[PDB]
Amino acid sequence: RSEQIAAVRRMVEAYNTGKTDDVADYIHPEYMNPGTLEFTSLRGPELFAINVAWVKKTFSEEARLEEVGIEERADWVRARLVLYGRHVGEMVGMAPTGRLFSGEQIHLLHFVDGKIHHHRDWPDYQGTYRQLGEPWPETEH
Amino acid sequence: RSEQIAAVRRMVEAYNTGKTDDVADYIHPEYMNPGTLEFTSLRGPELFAINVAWVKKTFSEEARLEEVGIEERADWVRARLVLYGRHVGEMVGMAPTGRLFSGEQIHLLHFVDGKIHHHRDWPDYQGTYRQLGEPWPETEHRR
Amino acid sequence: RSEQIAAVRRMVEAYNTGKTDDVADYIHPEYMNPGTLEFTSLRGPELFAINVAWVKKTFSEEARLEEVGIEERADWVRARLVLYGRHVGEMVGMAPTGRLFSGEQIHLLHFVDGKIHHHRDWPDYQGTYRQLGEPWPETEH
Amino acid sequence: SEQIAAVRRMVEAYNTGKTDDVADYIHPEYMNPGTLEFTSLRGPELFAINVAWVKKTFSEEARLEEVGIEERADWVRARLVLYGRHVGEMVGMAPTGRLFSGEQIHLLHFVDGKIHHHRDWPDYQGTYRQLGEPWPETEH
Numbered sequence: 291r292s293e294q295i296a297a298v299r300r301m302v303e304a305y306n307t308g309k310t311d312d313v314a315d316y317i318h319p320e321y322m323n324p325g326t327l328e329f330t331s332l333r334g335p336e337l338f339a340i341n342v343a344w345v346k347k348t349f350s351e352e353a354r355l356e357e358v359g360i361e362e363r364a365d366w367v368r369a370r371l372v373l374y375g376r377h378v379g380e381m382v383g384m385a386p387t388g389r390l391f392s393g394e395q396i397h398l399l400h401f402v403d404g405k406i407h408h409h410r411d412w413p414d415y416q417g418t419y420r421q422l423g424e425p426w427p428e429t430e431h
Numbered sequence: 432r433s434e435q436i437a438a439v440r441r442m443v444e445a446y447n448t449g450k451t452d453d454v455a456d457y458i459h460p461e462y463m464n465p466g467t468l469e470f471t472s473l474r475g476p477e478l479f480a481i482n483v484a485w486v487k488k489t490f491s492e493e494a495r496l497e498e499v500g501i502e503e504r505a506d507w508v509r510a511r512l513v514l515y516g517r518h519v520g521e522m523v524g525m526a527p528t529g530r531l532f533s534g535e536q537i538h539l540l541h542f543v544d545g546k547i548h549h550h551r552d553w554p555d556y557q558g559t560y561r562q563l564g565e566p567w568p569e570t571e572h573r574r
Numbered sequence: 575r576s577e578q579i580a581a582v583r584r585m586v587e588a589y590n591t592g593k594t595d596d597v598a599d600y601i602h603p604e605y606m607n608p609g610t611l612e613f614t615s616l617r618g619p620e621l622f623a624i625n626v627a628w629v630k631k632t633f634s635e636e637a638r639l640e641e642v643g644i645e646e647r648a649d650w651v652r653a654r655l656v657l658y659g660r661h662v663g664e665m666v667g668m669a670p671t672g673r674l675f676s677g678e679q680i681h682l683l684h685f686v687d688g689k690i691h692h693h694r695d696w697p698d699y700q701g702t703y704r705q706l707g708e709p710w711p712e713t714e715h
Numbered sequence: 716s717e718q719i720a721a722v723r724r725m726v727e728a729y730n731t732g733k734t735d736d737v738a739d740y741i742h743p744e745y746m747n748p749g750t751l752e753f754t755s756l757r758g759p760e761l762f763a764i765n766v767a768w769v770k771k772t773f774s775e776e777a778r779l780e781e782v783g784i785e786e787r788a789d790w791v792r793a794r795l796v797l798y799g800r801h802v803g804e805m806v807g808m809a810p811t812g813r814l815f816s817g818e819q820i821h822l823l824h825f826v827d828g829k830i831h832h833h834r835d836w837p838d839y840q841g842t843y844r845q846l847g848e849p850w851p852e853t854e855h
């Protein structure tokens with residue numbers, strides 16, 4: 291049994307259920323995901339929770355993250371996942387298309403003090419953009 | 432309106448419903464899809480109905496092709512679709528993985544005599560293979 | 575003859591030659607690429623120039639960006655490009671892998687005052703990472 | 716591993732275009748079902764015409780780079796990347812002259828110490844995108 295992989299699976303489950311009441315259990319106070327720096331200055335459990343909320347709002351309550359595979363090496367965990375969603379919310383200046391999409395993701399997680407301390411994630415931006423009909427942005431904001 | 436695009440949409444719906452009673456309406460008697468040459472020597476509506484049945488049996492009755500976009504140029508149609516399924520039957524000598532998957536597909540269809548005459552399709556093999564957990568074949572035959 | 579497309583082509587050639595002396599001609603003073611917020615607080619011609627220099631340093635002097643196609647819609651340009659390189663510098667806490675790679679990219683450019691004002695780009699992260707041999711990070715930094 | 720060594724020679728053959736010695740590692744009953752549309756050949760002769768077709772269509776400078784290779788019993792799985800330039804006719808599409816690069820997965824079955832079954836999955840969609848998504852001029 292890996293506590294690290296268990297913790298990462300709790301993180302995946304949060305995106306699925308949208309339930310983040312217990313996020314402080316597994317998200318470090320100093321948690322950072324550099325991928326959302328454009329959108330927020332938050333850190334820690336608050337940052338992770340708001341990103342979950344963003345996924346649920348932009349990609350619908352039916353948005354799911356399926357596990358392909360998870361592995362670990364020392365204090366790091368790598369997760370191979372697949373996002374399923376429907377584009378119901380505005381995203382980087384693009385109006386909702388209402389279109390279904392699915393895309394692989396890779397997530398890289400560093401543990402510090404038994405908690406997720408750094409989180410990088412790579413969506414399949416181009417593949418998702420294609421499935422969304424390659425919308426033109428209506429603004430840069 | 433385009434009759435060709437309409438015919439390609441009927442083709443897509445046949446994969447989705449598994450209903451193939453009427454395939455002779457839009458599939459040419461000389462219909463060929465070179466992608467299944469390995470598995471069968473069939474042609475025409477017969478080939479198409481078998482391939483539909485293969486999809487339903489292998490990727491489950493819930494297997495679905497969603498339309499992203501379809502364009503046409505003269506007697507040719509190009510469809511951008513996404514396949515969704517669960518791997519529940521043997522395929523190319525790999526045992527069922529039970530794995531959900533989804534992958535974009537490009538289809539190229541040539542119309543002749545008002546019917547789909549040639550059909551090339553490109554699954555996202557590698558993308559799907561990853562989602563299946565990259566299974567090793569148990570055999571190069573049937574099994 | 576689109577001046578916007580010509581400007582985006584000069585931008586592409588900059589990554590190719592590594593020459594940034596003239597970037598003020600086509601990069602807006604308030605130019606932003608949100609993709610590099612993790613790495614730098616720079617803006618304008620200076621931000622664009624350091625990012626080109628980053629590419630040449632990390633993906634080698636031989637790194638090339640190839641044009642597949644470029645379209646425009648009003649004050650916006652969308653470029654379909656392909657990056658070729660070899661991973662020779664540190665990148666997000668990963669040691670250099672020395673690996674060749676190539677990945678499609680989508681770039682979205684907003685023009686203001688006849689210069690590039692906003693720039694978003696989507697590398698094929700997962701495809702590239704596979705070609706890199708999927709390295710584990712040595713640090714989060 | 717002699718199997719991995721044999722698969723590396725196979726990869727080298729695409730790179731050099733040199734097919735003189737393919738009978739060394741290609742089984743007399745060698746099949747690649749991906750080319751059934753284009754030829755009825757089998758064995759070393761099939762493998763050799765497929766390498767020639769690659770050199771002809773994707774240029775003499777076309778090459779396969781290795782990402783990783785692994786094996787399980789009598790099977791080898793090779794993760795590769797094709798680099799090429801589209802200079803020859805291909806499934807009814809005229810040469811675009813365009814550069815492209817795409818990952819491939821190859822699955823090889825060994826029988827009697829030689830490559831007997833060969834399946835390969837190009838990144839068709841990604842390559843097609845890099846080629847400008849040309850429309851075919853003919854089905855044949």
Ligand SMILES: COC(=O)C1=C(C)CC(=O)c2c1cc1c(c2O)C(=O)c2c(O)cccc2C1=O
Pocket residue numbers: 326329341344345381382384393413414415416418419
């Ligand atoms: C035009 O859409 C995107 O930029 C996009 C695409 C194509 C694919 C994706 O998977 C995401 C986004 C954008 C995006 C997020 C995506 O996953 C995201 O998770 C995301 C987030 O988790 C928090 C704030 C903003 C976000 C985004 O703007």
Ligand SMILES: COC(=O)C1=C(C)CC(=O)c2c1cc1c(c2O)C(=O)c2c(O)cccc2C1=O
Pocket residue numbers: 467470482485486514522523525534554555556557559560
């Ligand atoms: C091991 O998996 C495959 O070969 C495969 C993958 C990775 C992705 C795919 O989309 C397909 C297949 C195999 C396959 C078919 C796929 O779509 C298919 O439609 C298919 C078919 O329609 C009729 C006979 C055989 C078939 C296959 O062997």
Ligand SMILES: COC(=O)C1=C(C)CC(=O)c2c1cc1c(c2O)C(=O)c2c(O)cccc2C1=O
Pocket residue numbers: 610613625626628629665666668677697698699700702703
């Ligand atoms: C581990 O690799 C990456 O993070 C990465 C990958 C997989 C693919 C890519 O294309 C890029 C990066 C990272 C990266 C940049 C990539 O293109 C980049 O352009 C980049 C940059 O232009 C300026 C600062 C940092 C950068 C990066 O960290």
Ligand SMILES: COC(=O)C1=C(C)CC(=O)c2c1cc1c(c2O)C(=O)c2c(O)cccc2C1=O
Pocket residue numbers: 750753765768769797805806808817837838839840842843
């Ligand atoms: C329109 O392009 C293709 O069909 C194609 C694409 C998009 C990507 C590819 O990698 C290949 C082909 C076509 C193709 C081969 C590709 O790799 C190939 O190796 C190939 C071959 O090895 C022998 C005969 C025909 C072949 C092809 O028609």
